[PDB]
Structure formats: structure tokens, C-alpha cells
């Protein structure tokens, strides 16, 4: 299932599993798993000749295989994408509320009145153009247009998780499925934030207590890697994340 990502997201282990899969799918002479000691990003840099030299018995086959994979990327499993999207949503909105301590959250495009951070100290308010009739009693029926509402919802923060509107207001958190709509915002770079306790990896994007000293505990390490797999699955599927321009990860480091 890892291979259902674009090869540019493949790890060293993924490339090796790719070999094993192809050896059985195409009945190839078996190649050593370390025939391509590299990740998919490096794999996309090699020439077909490098394939022939690294595997004289099946290198050309594998190259054209990689090319057929790039020419027709595999469709994603909807349940794994829902879960990925839900995981990133909770991560990101939780961090923003902790960084900037917004008093109100305006959730625009949420027909089910479900909080993605139920434990947060904030007033949560829901809006949707077509609310679920079983949740409309606590949802404002509203079609957001920047032209009509740019003067409203100016307190706290607005959340547009896959609610594609004409233009997002400046105090927004946005997920968008595939640039004039995003002028008030900036791209959200990757980060992982956790305040769960440490229990017994190097990267500047693992915002955890154990990484203040650079010695991330085994637990947050595993949780970081799970979160990066979910994030990659979402980005690889065509989502992008946008945020209010004052978003600052150093505010999250200050929570420790
Ligand atoms: N202009 C609008 N103003 C207000 N509401 C407006 C406006 N346009 C549209 N809507 C409403 O948004 C909504 C249009 S997506 C309806 C699903 C809920 C969106 N978020 C909740 C959520 C949570 C987790 C995952 C996902 C998710 C991830 C990937 C993909 Cl592929 C699809 C969904 C979504 C409907 O409720 C529309 O009636
Ligand atoms: K606003
Ligand atoms: Zn830790």
C-alpha cells in the first residue's frame, strides 16, 4: 500500500519491497534487496543505463516498470485517505489553537457539527450551506463568499477544511483539494507537534519536549513517522494546506 504513493515519496525500504514485488509479478531473476540502496527520490534520478548496470538481468524491465508507474499513478484507498485527512486536520488545528490562543473558532463548511479538537478551550461555531438535517439545529446555514462576509468572523480563527470558497479571509486555516483564492494566506509547511508524555530520528520539524535536546524518544519517533506517512498520503493525493500568515512554529516550542 506504501507503493500506492508516487515513487518520489518512496523510502529506501519501499524501493526494496518494490523489487521483491516485481520479481514475483514478472517472474524475474531475483535481485538482492540492496541493488538500489536509495530512496525513490534518488531512484527517479537514475538513467535506464544505470538500471542495466545495477541489474543486467532485469534492470531495463524495472526502468520501464517505474515509467509505467509514473505515467499512471495508482488510485488511492478512500478510507485511508479519509483517515489521513482527519489525522492532519486534528494535528494542525490543535497546534494553531495552542500557538495563538484564539477565543472563537468559526468552522465553515462543517455540515455535521463535529469538532476536530474537542478538548480545546475555545468557543466552537459551525456553518454550512447545506447542513445535515440531523445536525442543523446547531449549525448556521450560510454560504460563505468573501465578497459578502469579508467583514464578518473577524474574531478568533476560521477553519475551511476542504470548503472551496472564492477567497479565504486572513484569519484562516485551510485544506484544499486540487492561486488567487490564497492571497491572504501562506502555505503551511510540514511539522509534527505533540504534547503527549515521552516514553523510551533527527529533524527540526518534530516539535516535542524530547526534541528540545535533539534526543527524540522512541514513542514520539514512531508517532512522528506515522504522522509523516499520513501527511505524505494526503499531499500525494493532491491536497495542500494554507494558514494565516502569522503562524509561527516557535509558538509551539514555547508551550514546553
Ligand atoms: N461556499 C460555501 N459556504 C459554506 N459551505 C460550503 C460552501 N461550499 C461548500 N460548502 C459545504 O462544504 C462541504 C463540501 S465538502 C463535504 C464534506 C465535509 C468537509 N469538511 C469535513 C471533512 C472532514 C474530514 C475529511 C474531509 C474530506 C477529505 C477529503 C475529501 Cl476528498 C473530502 C472530504 C472533510 C459541504 O458541507 C458543502 O455544503
Ligand atoms: K474574517
Ligand atoms: Zn518524547
From Swiss-Prot:
It comes from Severe acute respiratory syndrome coronavirus 2. Coiled coil: none annotated. S-adenosyl-L-methionine binds at residues 107-113. Interacts (via N-terminus) with DDX1. Interacts with nsp10. The chain holds residues 6225 to 6433 of 7096 of the full protein. Plays a role in viral RNA synthesis through two distinct activities. The N7-guanine methyltransferase activity plays a role in the formation of the cap structure GpppA-RNA. The proofreading exoribonuclease reduces the sensitivity of the virus to RNA mutagens during replication. This activity acts on both ssRNA and dsRNA in a 3'-5' direction. The gene is rep. This is Guanine-N7 methyltransferase nsp14. It catalyses: a 5'-end (5'-triphosphoguanosine)-ribonucleoside in mRNA + S-adenosyl-L-methionine = a 5'-end (N(7)-methyl 5'-triphosphoguanosine)-ribonucleoside in mRNA + S-adenosyl-L-homocysteine. Residues 76-241 form the N7-MTase domain. It is found in: Host cytoplasm; Host endoplasmic reticulum. Inhibited by Remdesivir antiviral drug (GS-5734). Zn(2+) 16 binds at residues 198, 210, 217, 220.
Amino acid at each position: 500500500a506504501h507503493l500506492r504513493l508516487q515513487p518520489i515519496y518512496w523510502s529506501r525500504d519501499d524501493v526494496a519491497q518494490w523489487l521483491k514485488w516485481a520479481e514475483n509479478e514478472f517472474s524475474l531473476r531475483p535481485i538482492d534487496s540492496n541493488t538500489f540502496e536509495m530512496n525513490g527520490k534518488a531512484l527517479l534520478l537514475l538513467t535506464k543505463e544505470d538500471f542495466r548496470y545495477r541489474s543486467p538481468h532485469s534492470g531495463d524491465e524495472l526502468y520501464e516498470l517505474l515509467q509505467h508507474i509514473l505515467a499512471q499513478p495508482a488510485a488511492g484507498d478512500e478510507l485511508k485517505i479519509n483517515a489521513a485527512c482527519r489525522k492532519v486536520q486534528h494535528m494542525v488545528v490543535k497546534a494553531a489553537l495552542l500557538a495563538d490562543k484564539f477565543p472563537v473558532l468559526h468552522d465553515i463548511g462543517n455540515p455535521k457539527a463535529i469538532k476536530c479538537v474537542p478538548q480545546a478551550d475555545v468557543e466552537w461555531k459551525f456553518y454550512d450551506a447545506q447542513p445535515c438535517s440531523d445536525k442543523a439545529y446547531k449549525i448556521e446555514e450560510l454560504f460563505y463568499s468573501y465578497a459578502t462576509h469579508s467583514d464578518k468572523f473577524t474574531d478568533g480563527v476560521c477553519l475551511f477544511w476542504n470548503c472551496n470558497v472564492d477567497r479565504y479571509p486572513a484569519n484562516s486555516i485551510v485544506c484544499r483539494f486540487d492561486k488567487s483564492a490564497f492571497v491572504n494566506l501562506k502555505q503551511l509547511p510540514f511539522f509534527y507537534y505533540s504534547d503527549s508524555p515521552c516514553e523510551s530520528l533527527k529533524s527540526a520539524t518534530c516539535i516535542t519536549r524530547c526534541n528540545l535536546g535533539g534526543a527524540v524518544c522512541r514513542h514520539h519517533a514512531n508517532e512522528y513517522r506515522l504522522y509523516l506517512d499520513a501527511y505524505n498520503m494526503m499531499i500525494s493525493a493532491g491536497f495542500s494546506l494554507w494558514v494565516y500568515k502569522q503562524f509561527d512554529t516557535y509558538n509551539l516550542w514555547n508551550t514546553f
